[PDB]
């Protein structure tokens, strides 16, 4: 399964990165009632809120994150969306390590590094989601952008596991 | 009559808590696996056993195996 393991790792790395980048980019995290200027149904992402019915349908506006030190820190963290962006950064570095591992077969730790990056990306992703949900609620529904983030988390964790398996198998085969 | 509803046993916690519990479960299992393995000093906490440890910890059913390292014990303790 060595070739297949590496194929899964590469495909999964790309899939996780693509899903998370799209999710951070697109604007269908939340379906709720508000105004992109009476308030109509809308859809919000991390940055823009946009009306999807009415006169101003298709209009978008920057969210006013900043319209209680803990509340201030939550607002700050959710405004910058540091955690989703950090998740994208780490997925990028993990993918880069997976690509590089194909070259430097002498140094095993490259692929292990990939593994760790992906696992870490997953953790930042989860923090992201909690921060996002915690900030919002402080009716509605979640769009496909939110679920892209969630699937990115799952795939990232799977790819991390597979990468660490590759490294383990290298250091086991070497002992034999 | 307010008909209970088949999955009404989930009602005490919001849907977001349940979903985050599932994600936390995966993240804990993966980190326990990672900190237990890549330590080349030792290499019983493979991924499948990690998942089983974490599941049993959440259901308060205990375990066949406990972490022995400091890292595995930190993960276990916060979970």
């Amino acid at each position: 399964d060595r070739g297949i393991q590496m194929l899964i790792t590469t495909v999964g790395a790309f899939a996780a990165f693509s899903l998370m980048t799209i999710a951070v980019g697109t604007d269908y995290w939340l379906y709720s009632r508000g105004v992109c200027r009476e308030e109509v149904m809308t859809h919000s992402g991390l940055w823009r809120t946009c009306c999807l019915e009415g006169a101003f349908r298709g209009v978008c506006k920057k969210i006013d994150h900043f319209p209680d030190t803990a509340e201030y820190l939550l607002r700050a963290v959710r405004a910058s969306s540091v955690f989703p962006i950090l998740s994208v950064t780490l997925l990028f570095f993990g993918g880069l390590c997976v690509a590089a591992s194909e070259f430097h077969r002498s140094r095993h730790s490259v692929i292990l590094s990939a593994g760790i990056f992906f696992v870490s990306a997953g953790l930042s992703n989860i923090i992201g989601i909690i921060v996002y949900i915690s900030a919002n609620a402080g009716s509605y529904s979640y769009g496909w952008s939110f679920y892209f983030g969630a699937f990115s988390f799952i795939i990232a964790e799977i790819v991390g596991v597979v990468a660490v398996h590759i490294y383990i198998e290298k250091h086991q085969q070497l002992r034999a | 009559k307010s008909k209970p509803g088949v999955f009404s046993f989930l009602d005490p916690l919001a849907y977001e808590i349940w979903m985050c519990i599932v994600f936390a479960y995966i993240g804990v299992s993966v980190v326990l696996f990672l900190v237990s393995r890549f330590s080349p000093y030792e290499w019983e906490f493979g991924i499948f056993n990690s998942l089983w440890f974490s599941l049993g910890a959440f259901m308060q059913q205990g375990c066949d195996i406990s972490p022995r390292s400091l890292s595995g014990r930190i993960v276990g303790g916060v979970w």
């Binding site: 696992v119 953790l123 | 900190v35 890549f38 330590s39 390292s69 890292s71 930190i74 993960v75």
Partner: peptide
């Protein structure tokens, strides 16, 4: 606190690994 502890655990694992390496 949970995710904090997971981060901390990974850090301690790295430290212990490097210590046992050298």
């Amino acid at each position: 606190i949970l995710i904090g502890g997971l981060g901390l655990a990974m850090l301690v694992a790295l430290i212990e690994f490097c210590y046992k390496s050298r």
